[PDB]
Design an enzyme around this catalytic site. Sequence first.
Site, PDB file in Angstrom:
ATOM      1  N   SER A 247       0.854  -1.193   0.000  1.00 47.61           N
ATOM      2  CA  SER A 247       0.000   0.000   0.000  1.00 47.61           C
ATOM      3  C   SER A 247       0.908   1.270   0.000  1.00 47.61           C
ATOM      4  O   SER A 247       1.623   1.479  -0.963  1.00 47.61           O
ATOM      5  CB  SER A 247      -0.973  -0.075   1.193  1.00 47.61           C
ATOM      6  OG  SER A 247      -1.931   0.989   1.160  1.00 47.61           O
TER       7      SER A 247
ATOM      8  N   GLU B 206      -9.811  -4.563  -2.251  1.00 43.57           N
ATOM      9  CA  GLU B 206      -8.988  -3.491  -1.708  1.00 43.57           C
ATOM     10  C   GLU B 206      -9.844  -2.408  -1.068  1.00 43.57           C
ATOM     11  O   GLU B 206      -9.409  -1.801  -0.096  1.00 43.57           O
ATOM     12  CB  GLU B 206      -8.108  -2.846  -2.794  1.00 43.57           C
ATOM     13  CG  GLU B 206      -7.235  -3.840  -3.582  1.00 43.57           C
ATOM     14  CD  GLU B 206      -6.005  -4.238  -2.816  1.00 43.57           C
ATOM     15  OE1 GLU B 206      -6.003  -4.144  -1.557  1.00 43.57           O
ATOM     16  OE2 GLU B 206      -5.028  -4.643  -3.467  1.00 43.57           O
TER      17      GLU B 206
ATOM     18  N   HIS C  95      -7.571  -5.210   2.030  1.00 44.35           N
ATOM     19  CA  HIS C  95      -6.356  -4.462   1.789  1.00 44.35           C
ATOM     20  C   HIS C  95      -5.412  -4.809   2.941  1.00 44.35           C
ATOM     21  O   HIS C  95      -5.748  -4.636   4.109  1.00 44.35           O
ATOM     22  CB  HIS C  95      -6.654  -2.958   1.843  1.00 44.35           C
ATOM     23  CG  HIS C  95      -5.551  -2.093   1.318  1.00 44.35           C
ATOM     24  ND1 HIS C  95      -5.052  -2.211   0.028  1.00 44.35           N
ATOM     25  CD2 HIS C  95      -4.929  -1.016   1.872  1.00 44.35           C
ATOM     26  CE1 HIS C  95      -4.188  -1.230  -0.194  1.00 44.35           C
ATOM     27  NE2 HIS C  95      -4.094  -0.491   0.909  1.00 44.35           N
TER      28      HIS C  95
END
Lengths: 529, 529
Positions: free
Chosen positions: A197, A324, A437
């Site tokens: 990320s 996500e 995520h």
Amino acid sequence: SELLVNTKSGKVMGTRVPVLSSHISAFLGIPFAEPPVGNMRFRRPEPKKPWSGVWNASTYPNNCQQYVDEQFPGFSGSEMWNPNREMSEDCLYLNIWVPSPRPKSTTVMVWIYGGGFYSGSSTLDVYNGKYLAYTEEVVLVSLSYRVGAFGFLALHGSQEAPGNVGLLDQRMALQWVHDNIQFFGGDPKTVTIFGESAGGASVGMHILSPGSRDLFRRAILQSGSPNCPWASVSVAEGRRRAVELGRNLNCNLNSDEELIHCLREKKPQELIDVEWNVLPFDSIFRFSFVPVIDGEFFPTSLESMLNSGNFKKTQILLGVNKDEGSFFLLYGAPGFSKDSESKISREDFMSGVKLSVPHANDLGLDAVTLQYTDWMDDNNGIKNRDGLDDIVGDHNVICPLMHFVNKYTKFGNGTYLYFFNHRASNLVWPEWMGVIHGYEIEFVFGLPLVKELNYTAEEEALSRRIMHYWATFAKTGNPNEPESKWPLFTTKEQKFIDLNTEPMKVHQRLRVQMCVFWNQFLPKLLNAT
Amino acid sequence: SELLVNTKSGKVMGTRVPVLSSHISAFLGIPFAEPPVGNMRFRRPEPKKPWSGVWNASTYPNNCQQYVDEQFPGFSGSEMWNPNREMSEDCLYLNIWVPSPRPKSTTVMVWIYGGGFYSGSSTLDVYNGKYLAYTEEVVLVSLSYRVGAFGFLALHGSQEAPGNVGLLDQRMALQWVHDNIQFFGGDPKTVTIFGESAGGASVGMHILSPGSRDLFRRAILQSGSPNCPWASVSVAEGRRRAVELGRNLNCNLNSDEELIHCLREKKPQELIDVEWNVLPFDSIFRFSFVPVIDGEFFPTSLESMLNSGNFKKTQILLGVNKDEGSFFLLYGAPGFSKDSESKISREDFMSGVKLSVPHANDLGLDAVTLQYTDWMDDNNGIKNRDGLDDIVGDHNVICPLMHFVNKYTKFGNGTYLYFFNHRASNLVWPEWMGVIHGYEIEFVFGLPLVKELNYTAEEEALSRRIMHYWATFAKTGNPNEPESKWPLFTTKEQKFIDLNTEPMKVHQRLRVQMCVFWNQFLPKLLNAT
Ligand SMILES: COc1ccc2c3c1O[C@H]1C[C@@H](O)C=C[C@@]31CC[N+](CCCCCCCCN1C(=O)c3ccccc3C1=O)=C2
Ligand SMILES: COc1ccc2c3c1O[C@H]1C[C@@H](O)C=C[C@@]31CC[N+](CCCCCCCCN1C(=O)c3ccccc3C1=O)=C2
Ligand SMILES: *[C@@H]1O[C@H](CO)[C@@H](O[C@@H]2O[C@H](CO)[C@@H](O)[C@H](O)[C@H]2NC(C)=O)[C@H](O)[C@H]1NC(C)=O
Ligand SMILES: *[C@@H]1O[C@H](CO)[C@@H](O[C@@H]2O[C@H](CO)[C@@H](O)[C@H](O)[C@H]2NC(C)=O)[C@H](O)[C@H]1NC(C)=O
Ligand SMILES: *[C@@H]1O[C@H](CO)[C@@H](O)[C@H](O)[C@H]1NC(C)=O
Ligand SMILES: *[C@@H]1O[C@H](CO)[C@@H](O)[C@H](O)[C@H]1NC(C)=O
Ligand SMILES: *[C@@H]1O[C@H](CO)[C@@H](O)[C@H](O)[C@H]1NC(C)=O
Ligand SMILES: *[C@@H]1O[C@H](CO)[C@@H](O)[C@H](O)[C@H]1NC(C)=O
């Protein structure tokens, strides 16, 4: 002694740690910069002055100052991301796990934590590098960097708070690893930086920045890419947010010098208490202080750099997770909650898209809504919930990564793409959030190998093959052992593999349909209207 | 005598015609207006002056002057639409098929032919009304009206060529049927007007026009609706085309009077030779002279009339064919031909969409392209061909009809919707064209009942049930015999049935996905950009 290592900055003494009924050495809390405190807050990092004596590197360092999630006090799904050490602005340290006996010159992997550029720690249980270092015989490094205002407050033109200093902290740690890892048995010619990320966006940022390129060999990006819409702002927006932060703290706003001096006298927590107040829109998946397109760390716009091939050419391995967007809808979109199935009404769907594409006019919002609505069944709660989950994930993570990968591949030396879609059997988040995520990380770090964590045997096998793909790629530039082959992603074929407990399947053009909408049509639409 | 009928305009003598081994009476070529010749060209029609003596109505009348298709000389698929009588401006006649023995007061159906407002004839073999009149015992009428410049040249503000006179010809024939059909055994309180494509748009135009509403009871619209993008122009565009026509013929353009006088001295064929030259864009599915939004026949914009319920409230039965667009792509889009499978390249697809939405800017063209392209397989020839076929049909026929039906149903007294998708076993057009615009007509008129035409037994059965649905609806306002039920289309459920040789299936929201794009999103897009 195996636990004593002499580096260009001084001697360091580590500790022996048990791992899967064996043991390895860990050198925790090695400083790589001078503490960025007092008048150094907001400034570029300074290299750590060498020390005489032996630095005790037997324990984890403090975590950088950051906003702490208190939405689900004591819930493990959320506290696993929160700082687990005391927070301090004195937080610029790195950690190294070294196989035992000490290698002579082996593959090095350097982890860059995520956290939306406003949070994160190198010491989380999910980032424990002993399993990967032990199982794949690599020297594993995790660095740290300033987040939030401390790492990204940007008053472009000022040398006291130029912006991007958190990225410069990462670069400094990469310079230290380049200059010193050979003493720990690592091969500096073979350093792979990897991150998830904001850490994956950071990795792509070092691939782009001329000043970082030479410090590493290869790169892995998990659910993040440098061009993510939330990962950077212009110098004007950075300046505006910095001024708004000062305004929330009653600072004199007459000059950069006045603003900065006022911001430097505040305790860390005073800045964090108002951090979220400077966002320009009512939104989701947008963070206050992030990298700035400054003309220095980033010479020109990210898109022109991507288009002209102005970036490090090497091999990259990267991918995304199936859902996500769920984490972000749970935390701020109406209709979503942790303890319900979150079936979403048509109205909450519409208010969710508005929160998701904050920079869009009404025509743009209508385009998104039409693209993700099944009009033969628009009141279907599950469909509205999942559609919004896809909107958030496609706009913020998946399509920006697909745009990065197609641009990169044109000039690079080898690309491997994955789609991680295994929902862990022991996930504590609700079913509706899916493959969240950040939840591939525990597989990358080998947590399923420890029995007490309750994973299934097939999950342990999935973890073992992911770690072996990651390390073999770090070592050779190819995840495949020279068994089913993960094919190269090419401009023409665009192949990628699913990563899960099932026999490997190869597909092509990951979410092309939706990504043509996000990467080509919508921006043309917003630009014309 | 059964073949002699006295009407308010004079006596008329018909002819006995054989039908399916039986016989009925036909009164062909009954005049309903004064010939619109010489100084009457372009003018509103004048009622036929009554005649003494007996009008010989034993043979078909001339067809109005029109552009004749010569793309496939002698090919039956195309010549079946071409005039089959001599063309003349003296062409305002109607035809009546009357069951034998003469009914006293039975259901009346009045056919309005299509032809894009520039062609068409009431005498085509496919419009032979004897089968329907015989099989369902209805008095069947087919009227005629001026097409092309002769019926629609519009110089708004001039009383010499006000526009819409072709629609006024239809209205005059409906007035004649209202005033006289009782003498032929028809019940004037129960007249259903029905028409296909431009005839179906015309039907919806009489439903809207205050001055036509009272002349009929109920309506059937086949593959056409009044709001079709090709069915009307503004008075400014009508004026512009009229001026451009004069310019192609070297007319004095100083005043309306000068332009019209010049246009009236030209032979019919001189106007037709340059008719196509006045279109404003390179396009497909756009015709030169069509109805004009004049503030008289149409008091205000069609959309505001539809929105405010400013229209006749009664029952309507209507629907579309599966591949409405194919006929038009064959005739003008690159890549399509009659004798090949017409697999279309990505480039011809793109030039096809440009031809299809001539009024669109680039953003609009991109929106259409993205909406109909499978990006996982964009070079698929069949997919590009079929996608373009859907674009043309959805934009020009299907979505305009769905918009009309949802608006109408809010104020109407009963709606029945169909989707005709049977490909006739004896179709002479290629397979790629599918269920072509206009090819349900032969089923509506009962051609499959005549053995020599080579239809299958299931096609004869399909024809019999369609004719019975059409006549029962004409008679009662409901196609169902008071067997599988065709449900009412309601605002909430939006049900419709498939019309084919298979057991009836009911579905909902005919092409909603694509029609939200054409009816709501695209116009907002074009309006904003
Ligand atoms: C872009 O990747 C990220 C952005 C934020 C985070 C992560 C990201 O990757 C995730 C996986 C890994 O990399 C590390 C952190 C994670 C998980 C842990 N967490 C904390 C819990 C989830 C928070 C979701 C964002 C909502 C944030 N949020 C606030 O908490 C808040 C407080 C006050 C005002 C406004 C807000 C607001 O919008 C945040
Ligand atoms: C909107 O419904 C129509 C518009 C045109 C027609 C019909 C329509 O319904 C069809 C079924 C029924 O109602 C009656 C006529 C049909 C079938 C027969 N035909 C003739 C053959 C097909 C023609 C396709 C249109 C291409 C037209 N075309 C030209 O022929 C031409 C010549 C010179 C310059 C430009 C052009 C041009 O664009 C035309
Ligand atoms: C990565 O770069 C290497 C080295 O530059 C490429 O290997 C070369 O491939 C060409 C074929 O086009 C050969 O002529 C050279 O002899 C090769 N060089 C060496 C030293 O092997 C390789 O093809 C690139 N890989 C990718 C995926 O782009
Ligand atoms: C069509 O119109 C008729 C007559 O106006 C409607 O029938 C009426 O229905 C209401 C119920 O709302 C009754 O109270 C009246 O007694 C009925 N009138 C008659 C004379 O029957 C009918 O419902 C309408 N049909 C549709 C589909 O709208
Ligand atoms: C290193 O620090 C830890 C904890 O602070 C301490 O327990 C350990 O004994 C220290 N080692 C030395 C030799 O200073
Ligand atoms: C594993 O499972 C046990 C019993 O089901 C549970 O009580 C425990 O908390 C779980 N442990 C972890 C670390 O998930
Ligand atoms: C009617 O016209 C047809 C053909 O023009 C002719 O053959 C027929 O005899 C005519 N009938 C009368 C009585 O005029
Ligand atoms: C019907 O079929 C015959 C023989 O197959 C063919 O020659 C004839 O032209 C067809 N007739 C019509 C009117 O379609």
